[PDB]
């Protein structure tokens, strides 16, 4: 039900 | 660098 | 520079 | 009844 994620700090 | 998610057992 | 997010645990 | 998934570590 949970969906999503992260990135973009160093990249 | 992650994407996705989980759940759905009881709901 | 970060992109992405979370939702879906109970909702 | 489960939905969702994982990926993004290496790719």
Establish, for the pair of chains A and B, how many residue pairs have beta carbons separated by less than 8 Å.
Answer: 22
Residues present in chain B in total? 11
> From which experimental method does this structure derive?
NMR
Strands of the C3-7 sheet, one edge to the other: C3-7, A3-7, B2-7, D3-7
The whole-angstrom separation of Cα D10 and Cα C10 is 29
Asked if B3 and D8 count as a contact pair (C-beta separation under 8 A), the reply is: yes
From C4's Cα to the closest Cα of chain A, the distance in A is 5
Q: What is the dihedral of CA A10, B1, B3, B5, to 10 degrees?
A: -100
How far, in Å, CA of D5 to CA of C9, rounded? 14
Nearest residue in chain D measured CA to CA from A3: D4
């Amino acid at each position: 039900x949970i969906s999503x994620x992260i990135s973009x700090a160093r990249i």
